[PDB]
Design a protein around this ligand. Structure first.
Ligand SMILES: COc1ccc(C[C@@H](N)[C@H](O)C(=O)N[C@@H](CC(C)C)C(=O)O)cc1
Ligand SMILES: [Mg+2]
Ligand SMILES: [Mg+2]
Ligand SMILES: [Mg+2]
Ligand SMILES: [Mg+2]
Ligand SMILES: [Zn+2]
Length: 889
């Protein structure tokens, strides 16, 4: 089983200068002819010429137009084509081949495949070798000249990278298009699309060069009306890159294409970005509110790769975080600017601290630049993306905007063209650090540990105030737990954005200050502090760490009410909830363990409840922020704090705490649900396709969150509200009506009603499926069986399979049923999917990531299922590597 090591990187002994492809799409097969103009590099040591080529049917191969003979001059084993060195030229030569591939039966959705009636490619990371022979690694940069031919009636729209330089008719009802793409690119950025596509288009004129750029967005005909928001998003993304970074698009056209069958959200092929339809298409009538933020995010993200990933390339796959972490960071700056709500930053933190912290405390834990892989597809992770994004964001925190922009421009100017590594970026940032610190002895050598050290730092605090001296001290310690990657962990460069709040008047006591913690511990002292402050620590969540603030609940409530920083207020609320959860959880567990007939539970802090009411009733406070404060921290955040987590005991603990708070605030929640209606559900702009109001969507989030609370509580007559809510024109409302009706006899009436409203739009039906899947129903197993039989059937569409099964895995009570029936159900789906799509089968493993953090009975049940999956004779390499790592085997 082949392991690749980061430190083993060596340039190839071969060079590929030019790729000339002819892709001839037929009814039963596609024929790919390719000529590679090649050379011998300075690194060559007389080795065999070995190409990647997976599942290719060879018709012929040649060197310099002389046909090579199998067995004598080459061997092919369905993975590697080896041409023996004695047959390989010692100077520039041409390698040519013709192979047969079958996009119609390519259900793995990598390489060239058919999605409904569209033929489409996906090459990142190793998909190009599934289309033709290549040295399929990102440092093999080449020029591309691509011709596609197909049946004209079936496939009128033909697209690839670069300029369309010719179009032509072919006998027998066929037609062809030639595209030439002169600038060098790695092969994972190659794309081709053939289909009966419809489009919307616009022209964008760049900021400085004043280049006219043609923008096209494509879908199947049925959904072309859903393309408008994506076109607006693309204009916004171009403007932002211009305005913040001074970066203009370089090419004359940019195409975005939506397809129905896609392993991920989208892909940044140069001038030809290809999208999961769920991340490109939306309408007010047929999409939930989340679609709007998602499209903005994904269009922005793939656009931002044009510089960070495409123009500046990766040397090798170990550098993945350099394009993905940096591009997530760019999209976050963009979306914060576009949405102007604090919930954009909060939602990123909420994801990192639940999902990524869980990964980083699991057997899958890795640094953002891993040291080895077996299947690189397994390293497209929340760590590489989201922790990578936070590491990229810490440079901006450390440097500030002016110097951050200087360092980023140094990175672009020096590397445009060109493969790069994480050190290249650190080097550019360090040049700005030197400039900022006014000394050339300053360095960021220690900062590199953020790329190589796995695990989440824990940062803890002690405080001292001397009233007589007016002097305040913050003593800080950092600790990363040893793990399987490093026995010894080193101190990181941690920037700690801080304020000091005067608790008498809630005012700021110091200017903006970022403490640079670079040792295992340090004490920061402040003079002229007139009263003992409450510290506001890690403002904006300034480093990706466990924060142990050591504050009292009274201090935390004062920050929640009065602090200026959204993240610190949110975290203070989070910390109050966590202290309560851990206390009640222990009380319930002791009662269960001791089989007690009676016992006590510690009630929720009454001043905390009063603070929630205070914020909810403030008309000037943000609706998105309000929806976070009435929600308990995510289950996957909580599990990081509990050993041997008994999921039933956690479910009882959450229930008690929600009931405690609802018993005091339900009348307030009801009054707000009613009073927010006018603005939340305003229809003034319902038929304006480009008018998108993030605040209004956050008001709907709050309304729907309050409705869920009131429905769980069986608030008097709430069923009337639910039934009326089902009549709203907004899918976020009428789908909420289905899930909150789970607690009432009207559930299956709303099931049918909303099914009928959803069934005629592919993406809306997927949203309906998630809604059913996440429904808090005691008969959820029977309901999932009905979905399988009646709707999902044998669909191989990843969006369908993920919609039915993933939301259900968050059902803390039912998915973790002590019989193990939920673990069995998901393992069956995993093994079934693995037969045709190993990548999606691995995504479906997500619920097992926390297996060793549960109570011993559930650990045993999950392990048995994973061992059963591992024992499947036909298991993919991808799935096997993932399960071997996850089970420490
Ligand atoms: C496992 O193999 C792959 C192959 C290709 C990719 C595509 C990757 N480059 C692309 O930028 C990407 O992740 N977008 C995200 C969306 C952003 C907004 C985070 C997605 O798709 O959900 C990924 C993995
Ligand atoms: Mg094949
Ligand atoms: Mg502008
Ligand atoms: Mg986000
Ligand atoms: Mg379908
Ligand atoms: Zn990306």
């Amino acid at each position: 089983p082949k392991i690749h090591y980061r430190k083993d990187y060596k340039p190839s002994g071969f060079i590929i200068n030019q790729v000339t492809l002819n892709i001839n799409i037929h009814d039963q097969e596609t024929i790919v002819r390719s000529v590679l103009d090649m050379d011998i590099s300075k690194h060559n040591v007389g080795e065999d010429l070995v190409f990647d080529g997976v599942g290719l049917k060879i018709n012929e191969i040649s060197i310099n137009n002389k046909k090579l003979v199998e067995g004598e001059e080459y061997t092919y084993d369905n993975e590697f084509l080896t041409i023996f060195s004695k047959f390989v030229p010692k100077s520039k030569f041409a390698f040519s081949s013709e192979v047969i591939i079958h996009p119609e039966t390519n259900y793995a959705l990598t390489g060239l495949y058919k999605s409904k009636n569209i033929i489409v490619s996906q090459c990142e990371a190793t998909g190009f070798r599934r289309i033709t022979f290549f040295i399929d690694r990102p440092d093999m940069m080449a020029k591309y000249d691509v011709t596609v031919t197909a049946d004209k009636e079936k496939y009128p729209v033909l697209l690839s990278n670069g300029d369309k330089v010719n179009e032509f008719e072919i006998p027998g009802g066929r037609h062809g298009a030639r595209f030439n793409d002169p600038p060098l690119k790695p092969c994972y950025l190659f794309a081709v699309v053939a289909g009966d596509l419809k489009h919307l288009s616009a022209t964008y004129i760049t900021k400085y060069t004043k280049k006219k750029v043609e923008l096209y967005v494509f879908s199947e005909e049925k959904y072309v009306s859903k393309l408008q928001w994506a076109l607006e998003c693309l204009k916004k993304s171009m403007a932002f890159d211009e305005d913040y970074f001074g970066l203009e698009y370089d090419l004359s056209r940019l195409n975005l294409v939506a397809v129905s069958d896609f392993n991920v959200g989208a892909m940044e092929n140069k001038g030809l970005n290809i999208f999961n339809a769920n991340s490109l298409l939306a309408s007010k009538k047929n999409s939930i509110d989340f679609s709007y933020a998602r499209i903005l995010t994904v269009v922005g993200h793939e656009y931002f790769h044009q510089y960070t990933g495409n123009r500046v390339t990766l040397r090798d796959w170990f550098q993945l975080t350099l394009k993905e972490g940096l591009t997530v960071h760019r999209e976050n700056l963009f979306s914060e600017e576009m949405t102007k709500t604090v919930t954009t930053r909060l939602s990123h933190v909420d994801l990192l601290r639940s999902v990524q912290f869980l990964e980083d405390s699991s057997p899958l834990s890795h640094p953002i630049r891993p040291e080895s892989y077996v299947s690189m597809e397994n390293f497209y992770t929340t760590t590489v993306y989201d922790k990578g994004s936070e590491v990229m964001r810490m440079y901006l925190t450390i440097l500030g905007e002016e110097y951050y922009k200087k360092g980023f421009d140094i990175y672009i100017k020096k590397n445009d063209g060109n493969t790069a590594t994480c050190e290249d970026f650190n080097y550019a940032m360090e040049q700005a650090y030197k400039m900022k610190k006014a000394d050339n002895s300053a360095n960021l050598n220690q900062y590199l540990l953020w790329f190589s050290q796995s695990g989440t730092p824990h940062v803890s605090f002690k405080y001292n105030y001397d009233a007589e001296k007016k002097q305040y001290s913050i003593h800080v310690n950092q600790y990363t737990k040893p793990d399987e990657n490093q026995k010894e962990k080193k101190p990181l460069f941690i920037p700690i954005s801080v304020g000091l709040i005067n608790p008498e008047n809630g005012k700021e006591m110091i200017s903006q200050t970022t403490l640079e913690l670079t040792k295992e511990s340090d004490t920061f002292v402040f003079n002229n502090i007139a009263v003992k402050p409450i510290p506001s620590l890690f403002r904006g969540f300034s480093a990706p760490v466990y924060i142990e603030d050591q504050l009292t609940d009274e201090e935390r409530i004062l920050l929640l009410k009065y602090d200026s920083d959204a993240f610190v207020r949110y975290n203070s609320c989070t910390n109050i909830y966590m202290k309560q959860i851990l206390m009640n959880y222990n009380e319930f567990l002791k009662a269960k363990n001791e089989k007690l007939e009676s016992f006590q539970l510690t009630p929720v802090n009454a001043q905390f409840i009063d603070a929630i009411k205070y914020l909810l009733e403030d008309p000037h406070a943000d609706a998105g922020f309000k929806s976070y404060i009435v929600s308990l921290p995510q289950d996957r955040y909580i599990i990081n704090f509990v050993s041997n987590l008994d999921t039933d005991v956690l479910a009882d603990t959450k229930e008690y705490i929600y009931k405690q708070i609802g018993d005091k605030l339900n009348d307030v929640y009801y009054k707000m649900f009613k009073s927010l209606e006018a603005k939340a559900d305003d229809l003034t702009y319902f038929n304006d396709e480009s008018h998108v109001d993030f605040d209004q969507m956050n008001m709907r989030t709050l309304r729907n969150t309050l409705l869920s609370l009131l429905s769980k509580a069986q608030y008097p007559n709430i069923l009337n509200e639910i039934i009326e809510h089902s009549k709203s024109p907004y899918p976020s409302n009428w789908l909420t009506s289905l899930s909150v009706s789970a607690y009432f006899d009207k559930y299956f009436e709303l099931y049918d009603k909303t099914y009928k409203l959803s069934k005629d739009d592919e993406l809306l039906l997927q949203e309906w499926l998630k809604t059913v899947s996440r429904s808090d129903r005691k008969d959820i197993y029977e309901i999932l069986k009905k979905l399988e039989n009646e709707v999902l059937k044998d669909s191989k569409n990843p969006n369908d399979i993920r919609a039915v099964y993933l939301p259900f895995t968050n059902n803390l009570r039912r998915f973790h049923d002590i019989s193990g029936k939920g673990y069995k159900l998901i393992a069956e789906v995993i093994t079934k999917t693995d037969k045709f799509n190993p990548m999606v089968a691995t995504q479906l493993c997500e619920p097992f990531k926390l297996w060793n953090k549960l109570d011993t009975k559930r650990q045993e049940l999950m392990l048995n299922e994973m061992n059963t999956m591992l024992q499947e004779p036909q298991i993919s390499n991808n799935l096997k590597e993932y399960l071997l790592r996850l089970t420490n085997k």
